[PDB]
Design a protein around this ligand. Sequence first.
Ligand SMILES: *[C@]1(C(=O)O)O[C@@H]([C@H](O)[C@H](O)CO)[C@H](NC(C)=O)[C@@H](O)[C@H]1F
Length: 632
Amino acid sequence: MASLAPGSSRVELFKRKNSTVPFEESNGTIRERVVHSFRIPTIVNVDGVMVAIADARYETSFDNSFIETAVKYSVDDGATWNTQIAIKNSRASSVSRVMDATVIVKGNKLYILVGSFNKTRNSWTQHRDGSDWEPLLVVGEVTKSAANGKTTATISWGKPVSLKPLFPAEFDGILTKEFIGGVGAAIVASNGNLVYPVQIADMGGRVFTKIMYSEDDGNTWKFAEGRSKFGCSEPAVLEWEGKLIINNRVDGNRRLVYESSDMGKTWVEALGTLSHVWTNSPTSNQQDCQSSFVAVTIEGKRVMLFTHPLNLKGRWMRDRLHLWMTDNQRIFDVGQISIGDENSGYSSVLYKDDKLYSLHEINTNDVYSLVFVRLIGELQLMKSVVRTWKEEDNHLASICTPVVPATPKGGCGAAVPTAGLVGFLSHSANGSVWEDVYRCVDANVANAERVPNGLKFNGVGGGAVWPVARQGQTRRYQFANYRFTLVATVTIDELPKGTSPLLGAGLEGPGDAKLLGLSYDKNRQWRPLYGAAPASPTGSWELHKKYHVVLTMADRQGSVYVDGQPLAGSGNTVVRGATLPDISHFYIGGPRSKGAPTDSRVTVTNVVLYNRRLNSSEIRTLFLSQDMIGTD
Ligand SMILES: *[C@]1(C(=O)O)O[C@@H]([C@H](O)[C@H](O)CO)[C@H](NC(C)=O)[C@@H](O)[C@H]1F
């Protein structure tokens, strides 16, 4: 189906039952040994040298088997590679193993944290105690040099050091058992700290994540105070605008994402941005998978990249590996980078010298290879999208809005708000799709006719659905359940028989409940909808006149503004309970595929969506600049 893009290609770099590694016998003799499966990929850039790290599972692909950490490195961007076994296992039994490498690059050093086991045949979280385990830190040093035009490099690996003595016996009364790195690429924070996200198993077997960091290049390590809820594993971390963003694997439920502004001391779920957006399968009740999560700069803009399989086949098949790019506001699906319906798995992404690559698993009959992918077609699309984002943000921020009684300048009022601006439906549209100017989430349309910057509705179900929970598996507007601002310019074209819908956020579930919204009636009054509260008519409007509508929701309170002023009933609680609402979609006009044959004769233009509640000054600015923001 969707797949590795034209222009892109790949090679089977770590070839199952084919590629050999320099296995070192007890006597020190080296033997090129065949490897059943290569798993747990990570590819990073160390001073210009590509370094690929992986589990070499010599005899079988099972987790509790004979495994050592293999490395392939290249000084020519993948033209050629050298192979080493960077970390040996204990050689204690037929199942001794060092596994699940988590890597940090600082300068010309590579810090690799692995889980080392001697003889257990069951899963690490299920062990009776931590006795078969050791968390091992290994430092590698990359040295390159050129003699007569040819550049080559070597990598020396230090002796492993166990961090077991630094592991607290308890965290808040929680008795600890074992811990392993989050798997994949970790980071050096802006303050120089080595930051490893770790997964901790407690005695009873619960798992949760934490930040383990070093302020002195690995001489000492500290476990920060904060942690994820239980149930989180294989965390990936990146630094964004002064905060650590921790993206967790969650078997059997949606992926939790946290932010910490204080080196992991305090964690706050990112309910307004990325938490619960991604998941393990269409139904979310399947085994989840490791994901890479890296911050990069493309076309002058800082963005985050995230990889994860759709896993339509379920369990560990992990078919359809996708790559997403986000600037913490918009979330773009770059596409599927694996091929057809092949099984993929754990993955890594790297942006080096303006070229994008991936190292990821492919699985056939549970025999694993690692492919090295040149994401050429994908980078081209990413750059195009980032240019769209920059261009539209700059354009909007450059509009000279009208001065207000307390302004100061090129004689312009406040800038049109662009911070937290997530989607925008304006001019571009056809008969079936109203395009998101930011190219992420389009709205579906019915019985509509184009007008400058929007659509005029006429017909049963005429209107548009901007999907929220209806996006399905990946819920990019999941933030709306926590807070949002929806804006639009509207005209009522023909009087309704009784009451008819105009704009709002619908809720999943029976009946036809709304979280917040606005309708209009035959008496030419507005009918704001505040959660489940009885709607009472208020105010006055006239046919054919343009009105500005703003819906705000934050802290469970909802307000509805018409022409910059709140309608009666605004400002009260719209969601009772502690459980987050579950918005199905935002409706524009009166869309529907069933139930009452709604036919709202209205025209709507310039629909803007923010992931926060706009303040009074921003609402006034939008009200005053309605004629200036359209893409027409
Ligand atoms: C991944 C995998 O699902 O494919 O699973 C890890 C854990 O088994 C899983 O998170 C449950 O605890 C394996 N790691 C270990 C140490 O078991 C990974 O190696 C990988 F197998």
